[PDB]
């Protein structure tokens, strides 16, 4: 790759990581407020908590099904009792937690239903303590397709940036780049964002954030997510519940 391209990349990447996260302009990164956390599509986003292991993000795609990363599901080591899902959870700056839709225990974990090479997993939830499924309280995220995405497109990534602030849902504007090498994009994310939903202007889920991978050369990074194409969509239809 060329130097002119590298310089350009550094300047763009610097817009998100050149300043402290608390100082990022609102249009690029911001907290989802109380009112919005109870509106679609924000309410389909929840915290995937793996006891004593990690705290990431997940998206409700079925009545009892949560979509997240395979690398996140792996932390549970096949034991569903170590995992819980908390939709629209919020721990304010005073340390007070609120779970408007309650907290859900996990019934089963499908670590790699799309194949070990695809960083996606399905988590099956149990109903609440009253026998009501999460999918009956709120509508699951409408699944779209990444096939219509073009380089330069700006989308909304929604999740729980744990490393920045614990249990506080945030939205990050992302900008797609070099789609010939997968769903790559500029934008601010932290490890906790693993499993974050990527939505288009119509509120359709088109991808799931995964992690940061090398870009251009070994000494540069970019965000990487899994796009939702025909294959991913079909498996979801076969396994959804």
From Swiss-Prot:
Highest rank taxon of the organism: Bacteria
InterPro entries documented for this protein: Glutamyl_endopeptidase, Peptidase_S1_PA, Peptidase_S1_PA_chymotrypsin, Peptidase_S1B, Peptidase_S1B_tx, V8_his_AS, V8_ser_AS
Broad enzyme group: hydrolase
Location of the active site: 71, 119, 194
Biological process, per Gene Ontology: proteolysis; symbiont-mediated disruption of host cell-cell adhesion
Keywords per UniProt: Calcium, Hydrolase, Protease, Serine protease, Signal, Toxin, Virulence
Cofactor: Ca(2+)
Keyword Transcription regulation listed: no
Zinc-finger recorded as keyword: no
PROSITE patterns for the chain: V8_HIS (PS00672), V8_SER (PS00673)
EC assignment: 3.4.21.-
An annotated Gene Ontology molecular function: serine-type endopeptidase activity
Family: Belongs to the peptidase S1B family.
Annotated function: Has serine protease-like properties and binds to the skin protein profilaggrin. Cleaves substrates after acidic residues. Exfoliative toxins cause impetigous diseases commonly referred as staphylococcal scalded skin syndrome (SSSS).
Protein name from the UniProt record: Exfoliative toxin A
Origin species: Staphylococcus aureus
Classification lineage: Bacteria, Bacillati, Bacillota, Bacilli, Bacillales
């Amino acid at each position: 790759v060329s130097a002119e391209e590298i310089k350009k990349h550094e300047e763009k990447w610097n817009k998100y990581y050149g300043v402290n996260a608390f100082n990022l302009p609102k249009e690029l990164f911001s907290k989802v407020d109380e009112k919005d956390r109870q509106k679609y599509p924000y309410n389909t986003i929840g915290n995937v908590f793996v006891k004593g292991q990690t705290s990431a993000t997940g998206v409700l795609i079925g009545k009892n099904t949560v979509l997240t990363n395979r690398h996140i599901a792996k932390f549970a080591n096949g034991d569903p009792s170590k995992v819980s899902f908390r939709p629209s959870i919020n721990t304010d700056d005073n340390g007070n937690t609120e779970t408007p839709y309650g907290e859900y225990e996990v019934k089963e974990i499908l670590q790699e239903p799309f194949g070990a090479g695809v960083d996606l997993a399905l988590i099956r939830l149990k109903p609440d303590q009253n026998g009501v499924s999460l999918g009956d309280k709120i509508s699951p995220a409408k699944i779209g397709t990444s096939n219509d995405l073009k380089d330069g497109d700006k989308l909304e990534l929604i999740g729980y940036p744990f490393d920045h602030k614990v249990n506080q849902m945030h939205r990050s504007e992302i900008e797609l780049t070099t789609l010939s090498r997968g769903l790559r994009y500029y934008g601010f994310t932290v490890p906790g964002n693993s499993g974050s939903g990527i939505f288009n202007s119509n509120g359709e889920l088109v991808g799931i954030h995964s992690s940061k991978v090398s870009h251009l050369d070994r000494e540069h990074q970019i965000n990487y997510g899994v796009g939702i194409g025909n294959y991913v969509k079909r498996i979801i239809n076969e396994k959804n519940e």
